[PDB]
Amino acid sequence: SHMLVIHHWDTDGITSAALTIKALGLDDFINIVPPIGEFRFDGRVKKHIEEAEKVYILDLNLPQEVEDVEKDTVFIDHHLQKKIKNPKVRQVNPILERMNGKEFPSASFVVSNHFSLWNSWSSLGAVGDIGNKAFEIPKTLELLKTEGLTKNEALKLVQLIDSNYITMDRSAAEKAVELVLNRPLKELLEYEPWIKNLEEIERTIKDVLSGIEVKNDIAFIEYSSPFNIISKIARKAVWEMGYNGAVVLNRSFHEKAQLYFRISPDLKEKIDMEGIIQILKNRGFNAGGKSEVLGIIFEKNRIDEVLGIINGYLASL
Ligand SMILES: Nc1ncnc2c1ncn2[C@@H]1O[C@H](COP(=O)(O)O)[C@@H](O)[C@H]1O
């Protein structure tokens, strides 16, 4: 009786949701996100699934939860993940399907290719996942050009849209899909509620950047905060400050710990980020990522365990 669209909480997932909603010609939909930084379906998500008729899951590297879905489901993602056995799920992943993953930098590009619907939201998703490197793909700037948007304007839009999930606002992150659907991107650059979020986030990121240390050109950044800034801290440490690797640890993310391990393409060969994921998953950790980035949420008492595993690989550099 309803159309459900579960999607990631960042720009990549929010643009993917808008692209999916537009391509399907939906006039009656429910779009939700799982709890930020929990990487699992909670009660709220599970109830919507039972009520909805068809479900779309976008940019959510959590197959173990999709495996149990008893609805007709299309699962689109670009993370490195395991093949889903559930027959009710139609998995669309241009990594499992063996195709090149550099052709698909973000879920937005995967969704666009899936529906053959290319607009500026396609670009935003790419910028929200690989940042400035998305502009080295000609499709990005060209689509941004139609809407008369500059490089910086899209980078600013990623910060504004991301500002919702960083501030832990499930409702504002979900509503961002309606605003992208119903307002030009260049209008949302003026959207005051997002702007107010971003001012408080930059101010608090500077604090974490002040207490960073370094070894072997690897940045070790430890902090405690309820904001989900761990994604940007790892990027800022590697992408902007130029370090070869960043290990970011949040000790008090809402009664749980949170660690991120991002490397530069230079170390992408020397470090097997895929293997480190499997080792963490085998050990019962809620871990996922890509070939250059690591994300974990776990119990506070396993912080030393996690650090030992990663300092393990870091010791062979
Ligand atoms: N516990 C987890 N389970 C599955 N995927 C994760 C997890 N933690 C982080 N990720 C993914 O890792 C990617 C890298 O984060 P980021 O560098 O901020 O884009 C993100 O797209 C996350 O979705």
Numbering used by the authors: -1 to 315
Share the article's original sentences.
Methanothermococcus thermolithotrophicus is the only known methanogen that grows on sulfate as its sole sulfur source, uniquely uniting methanogenesis and sulfate reduction. Here we use physiological, biochemical and structural analyses to provide a snapshot of the complete sulfate reduction pathway of this methanogenic archaeon. M. thermolithotrophicus activates SO42− by conventional ATPS and APSK, but transforms it further by uncanonical enzymes.
While the genome did not contain any related PAP phosphatase, a gene coding for a putative phosphoesterase was found in the genomic environment harbouring the ATPS and APSK genes. This PAP-phosphatase candidate, belonging to the DHH family, was recombinantly expressed and produced inorganic phosphate (Pi) from PAP at fast rates (50.2 ± 5.9 µmol of Pi released min−1 mg−1 of purified enzyme with manganese). To decipher the mechanism of this uncanonical PAP phosphatase (named MtPAPP), the enzyme was co-crystallized with manganese and PAP. The monomer is composed of an N-terminal (DHH, residues 1–180) and a C-terminal domain (DHHA1, residues 211–315) interconnected by a linker region (residues 181–210), forming a central groove. The DHH domain contains the catalytic site and the DHHA1 domain serves as a scaffold to bind the substrate with high specificity. The first one, partially observed in the structure, is coordinated by four aspartates (Asp8, Asp10, Asp57, Asp127) and a long-range interaction with His6. The absent second Mn2+ would be coordinated by the Asp10, Asp57, Asp127, the DHH motif (His76, His77) as well as by water molecules. While the AMP shares a similar localization with structural homologues (β9β10β11), it is bound by a different interaction with the protein. The nucleotide binding site would ideally place the 3′-phosphate of the PAP in front of the manganese when the enzyme is in its closed state. The inter-domain movement, allowed by the linker, would facilitate a rapid exchange of the substrate/product, increasing the turnover of MtPAPP.
